[PDB]
Design a protein around this ligand. Sequence first.
Ligand SMILES: NC(=O)C1=CN([C@@H]2O[C@H](COP(=O)(O)OP(=O)(O)OC[C@H]3O[C@@H](n4cnc5c(N)ncnc54)[C@H](OP(=O)(O)O)[C@@H]3O)[C@@H](O)[C@H]2O)C=CC1
Ligand SMILES: COc1cc(Cc2cnc(N)nc2N)cc(OC)c1OC
Length: 204
Amino acid sequence: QQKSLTLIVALTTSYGIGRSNSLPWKLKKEISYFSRVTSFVPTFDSFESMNVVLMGRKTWESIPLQNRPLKGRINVVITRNAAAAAAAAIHSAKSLDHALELLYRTYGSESSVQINRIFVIGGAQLYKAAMDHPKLDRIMATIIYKDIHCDVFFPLKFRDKEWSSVWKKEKHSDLESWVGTKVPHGKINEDGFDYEFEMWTRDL
Ligand SMILES: NC(=O)C1=CN([C@@H]2O[C@H](COP(=O)(O)OP(=O)(O)OC[C@H]3O[C@@H](n4cnc5c(N)ncnc54)[C@H](OP(=O)(O)O)[C@@H]3O)[C@@H](O)[C@H]2O)C=CC1
Ligand SMILES: COc1cc(Cc2cnc(N)nc2N)cc(OC)c1OC
């Protein structure tokens, strides 16, 4: 493939991600961080360059009807059906690769709109397919320092010893460089607990 995928997730230290088909916490600076990262397209390329967000159907269903599609990003919803899709615009694909194929077909060299970065934004199930994909090389993880009760977990303990020779946490300086903006270094406290922004990579 051409472009690598980037995964972006918030999780607890016990790898909880979801509870109620929603996020187990209300963290405004986290969502903001999420918005900036998945939307940032280096300045010289902006009139035409858009980032892609690739999220599973349950995650699509979790976004408030008002906030979807996710603004300023090519939204693509992953589903093993074709189905009926509530899209006034809304791409649909049956796999991560089927989505990539649809994006490169649709947003080619002769396109008014061109793809910059592709983000996988959730679904535990879709986070599982991403973690197995060859082009995934980067996780933008928000670490939440509380064992908040979840019913949905991140599928791979990427920050644990067992996966430390594959997955590596990058200096905060390399995080800022990659995201192209300053990012809060160290713990943030919002709604009763600490969280922080990390960046991990695994060599292609
Ligand atoms: N903390 C965080 O950063 C995030 C947390 N979340 C949370 O995660 C939960 C959602 O996770 P989960 O329930 O697994 O759902 P997903 O969002 O992964 O949606 C799963 C559905 O999407 C489709 N799908 C997912 N992966 C694939 C695949 N590889 N191929 C084909 N279709 C696929 C299938 O749709 P179909 O049934 O149509 O076949 C599947 O039924 C919620 O609790 C949500 O709030 C979500 C994003 C981020
Ligand atoms: C934009 O708001 C939301 C974003 C997400 C995805 C998400 C949020 N934060 C991070 N770090 N990663 C993600 N993949 C998940 C959500 O709920 C499941 C949201 O609420 C509507």
